[model samples]
Target: NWFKITIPYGRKYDKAWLLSMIQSKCSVPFTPIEFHYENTRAQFFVEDASTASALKAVNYKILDRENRRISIIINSSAPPHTELKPEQVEQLKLIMSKRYDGSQQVLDLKGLRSDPDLVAQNIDVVLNRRSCMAATLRIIEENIPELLSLNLSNNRLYRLDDMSSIVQKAPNLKILNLSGNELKSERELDKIKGLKLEELWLDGNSLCDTFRDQSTYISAIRERFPKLLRLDGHELPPPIAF
Candidate 1:
């Protein structure tokens, strides 16, 4: 029933304001059930087709500040079946083989969209979308639940909701890398907070800029991932135990 509504993204349009706009401008009395934001887009989910059509019908006139017509692009965010193709499974296996280390139990899925073989064959394995990440995670969870480390850098990813399952799926995962992506806020990591990462990388995402000060940035991250021993390539001093 969920339908995602997307608007052009900018610093000028934050999540709160985007939610505010939708409620004010949409034709029917409606409220979005959830909202997700990134540097490139502000997205929200309306409950069903009725609200979807009602919201889409507005097409949303842009605010006076921007003074440009913002035609909200409404798309289905429903959980549709994502049956993996044999070819997809085999290639992912090859990709996983090239990256997954049995001895270290580390899986490096870094810059997947830029992999030469994938590019040469014109294949796009997008883990940002819900089901795509699900299938990818499904494969790893089925085979390597003992995985110790995982890297998901440079994927243009934003859906932490989908990534959150990695906590239980790979219960032993101790280190995680999400260094480079479109993530724009520190709160985005809340969904994945249960991951209990010993080491985590969040250096290159737009999220870093959201923190006005460095110590505060570290503090916020520290609070969320209490087990984190290293952050952004540096060792944290020590956690205060009370």
Candidate 2:
């Protein structure tokens, strides 16, 4: 049952389908949720805590338009997992429906990305960029509303604009980790105001010796979001400039 020579399009699609199937079967033991399929990709609303952990461990990387790994996400426990008891599954399911469905009350990203008509209508929308970052934001906006924390580390975002869209969108966003980008000034974050932003991870950046001071960087964020629950913000020395 071997075709040593690959059939042009059929062979490639079949291979991808097999991989996608494996992913579907692999996720079943942990959660009782539905799965969606399009071309060679799949998305699931995993209901089982243990299965979600396993999926995160494999580190599924999404490629940008340029075929580069631009967004990286790893989930340990649902942030504020303790907040939701087993009895709350129904509530979560309802929220999920609002998001994925065409209801105006929820964050609907379905028709926004590459949906021919949606893209035509909202050509200038930030989500039209067709990048992994946009997909990540759309996922957050549409799927996981209970998102209490997020960590963006060692990624390839070169501009502040890439991060600002997040502040404008995610009102409930609390913890932000920008540990890898070589950003020096905190002016980028200043673009978005009144974010209930609590924590910031400034471990690796183009910060100066004075900026290396954790206290100053934290103080700056505190000045911005007074109630920020800073984690790495506590152990620094100070900010060198602005």
Candidate 3:
């Protein structure tokens, strides 16, 4: 059983300290509060109707008297950002582990942003639509490595440092999908120098329109990625026989 109580709300009273003081004063087993400090109002749940009556006796107004005993917390510390139960963590690990194919050397973290903290904690695990920033790349290099094809498209990335990080960490990388990201200009491609990428996808990005002339755009792309066999699904022409 529980009894809901409302106390005069003010910043001076800390929720935990106040709740503890009140519970101790009640002298009866009482649960924590249900919602607390909603502006000028504070809510609480008491152990039972007798505890509720006891609190009323102690000048604690019973906004609505009832009999109950359920625990509650107020103004607690920052909750876990990606609070997954142990079972949920296990489930995510199982799903991600299945995607890791040692034979293919492909670890598909396509939309790992779905769980930021969990993904951040297990940066090795895997995406939503957030940028694959340098921090994220560092985590992967330190944890999940040895990959050939890396799909980081649609991650809203627009930084050269992130591109450099990928190239430096995943040297064996052959296929990369940077499509649908915010990568702009041929100059940004300079970050990927020395990368042995065979296929590059830069569709759906500002680079598609960075240059005025289509021929110049195609030529610059070819120059940037000399060994690339395909661009945005189109097969590249062989290099000039200089």
Candidate 4:
């Protein structure tokens, strides 16, 4: 008999194997057997009671059968969905629109939780030592296009691979803060080559010790950002015009 069973583990129902077992044991033709899954449970729909009896013989619980079909109700209190609502988009836009009044048009969206829902909701939109993952940055890209400077310091950003996308979106980005993120490699920096960043703050990160010496670190960062005017808040020495 076809009966839904809540297994100990998240088990995907194997129709072929179950059909073989039922046919071998019950000897009843249970054709058109259907199986559905929800969370950690699986529901099986059989043709009749005979098939259900056969499964019961093998120690399977029949959650529901015949009279009423199994139903799954999606609760309203479920986790926030991925798609952004119209108001959410506007809220995020407002959060990212806070610009610093200075020579460089800096957009300061630091320490805002970088998750999609968090950013959309603007739940805690302050510099609270939060993180800004790549996905969150992508949302900023779509909304704010003319960004000249970005202060994402103290946000737990671990990857620069997606900086390429940011550079593509904000071609005029001059100053960027990736400090306090404990970044460890220079591999991802290669992706942002040709972006003319004026000032870069990476003082609080775990940047590779291979560039331990100040000059070496400056040269390495300068290599990635050719027009880099400052490193870790210090101004860069002018290149020789020999």
Candidate 5:
């Protein structure tokens, strides 16, 4: 049986180094106090005094094995006047990754924000605009090695033809959401049949009108993504005779 250890809250806990030092010695349900210092630099700067200070530091406690902190970071820090270039942001991401500890994984935006230049290292990333027509998407497919899931819901996407990037680079993708967009033809999705993706979301978007009927769309998907758990907003459409 596992034993539980709870530590009282205090100012002693701050930063990740302390926790790492403690975990090395402790085991099982060991409760520890932690303080989080929210970096004000990330937030957009406003001229107002009160509003600026309002977004200052905050703290919280972590309860051993009971509470696991999950962090999802999306860089909406596009340059105001300069319009952050993809290359510039990609550089920053690389720097950030080097500083991150291996034990702590936070959702990053390497694959989705722009063209990604990262290799998989047990990190869970949810890239936005997975189904984009931009050439950057192609770059991400060619670069970033280990990918998890990509969101391709809002863009001028109309097909999935040049998916060589995903097939070759992202060998570990588990979920793919291509909803809320337009695919010129159902045949486009057919091209992705052999991909390693397991969960696919094709709903809330535009599919080929030729296969607008639910039965037709479902049939096409079933033929391709055989192991798919979810498709077109539902689990495999009722077995319909093509």
Candidate 6:
């Protein structure tokens, strides 16, 4: 069970010291929390509910070096404890692994919910889950760092916040297929604005319905992805200069 613990977000708290302290007590791997100060609450994922329960027991006792008591609230992350399980991790990896082709440098993760194995096991790899995405999709950073083309369509992705970091790992991505997605707004596209993609497929998405003009849509998308030379399957004419 992946237990996401929430604590007060602050620069005053020693992250490294806190993590080291936790690691000493609980052997379960901890996923580093996104340490942006603007974030209202700080959170990190621990492997088991038992570890979290133990932490809750210690609660306010775990203080800083100067003995400033850090208020530790081990709030129940979903079950008070039920998050993604270890078996599900392996199951997700298995599905993702089957779709990857190193030779082609492609990672096709389209329609992950429809996978037969996943269906049989009644598993759904919800991309929106930041913990789930980071844990399993860390493979892109670890192994397939050189990935080029990616088919991320049919994931029913909405926020695109969690999976937006894919650009940092697979930076060389040139061809991307985002067809048949649940993206309703063009603003969601901005979440992944840093991608260096040359070709893209945003067909069959609800965002397409919003743009009143073809030129407006093309220009809007082109502005975000400067390197984008193709939209959907068609090659775009060179962007006009001011």
Cα RMSD for candidates in order: 17.0, 19.3, 13.2, 12.8, 18.5, 12.2
lDDT (Cα) of model 1? 0.79
Runs off by more than 4 Å, candidate 1: 1-84
Q: Name model 6 segments beyond 4 Å from true.
A: 1-82
- Highest TM-score, which number? 6
Q: State the weakest 10-residue window (summed lDDT) of model 1.
A: 78-87
C-alpha root-mean-square deviation, candidate 5:
18.5
What's the ranking of the predictions by lDDT, best on top? 1, 6, 3, 4, 2, 5
Winner on lDDT (1 vs 4): 1
lDDT tens per residue, model 5, 27-136: 32233222232222111222333322222211122333436422212222223223233443455456445533334222233224333344443232333234333333
- Over 155-190, each residue of candidate 2 has an lDDT whose tens digit, in order, gives 533455654677655767676666665566666567
How high a TM-score does candidate 2 get?
0.41
What does candidate 4's lDDT look like per residue over 22-64, in tens digits? 4555445655334444344544454456655555454432222
Clashes by residue pair, model 5: none
Model 6 Cα shift for residue 184 (angstroms): 1.5
In model 2, what are the clashing residue pairs, if there are any?
A: 198-229, 211-240, 213-236, 213-237, 213-238, 214-236, 214-237, 215-236
Which portions of model 5 miss their true places by more than 4 Å?
1-144, 237-242
lDDT of 6 by residue, 7-102 (tens): 664456666777666555554544544333425455655556777776666456666777676655665454322246556776777787889998
State in Å the error of residue 150, model 6: 1.2
Better of 1 and 6 by TM-score: 6
lDDT of each: 0.79, 0.47, 0.61, 0.58, 0.45, 0.74
* Residue pairs with backbone overlap in model 3: 1-67, 1-68, 1-69, 2-67, 2-68, 111-127, 112-127, 112-128, 113-127, 113-128
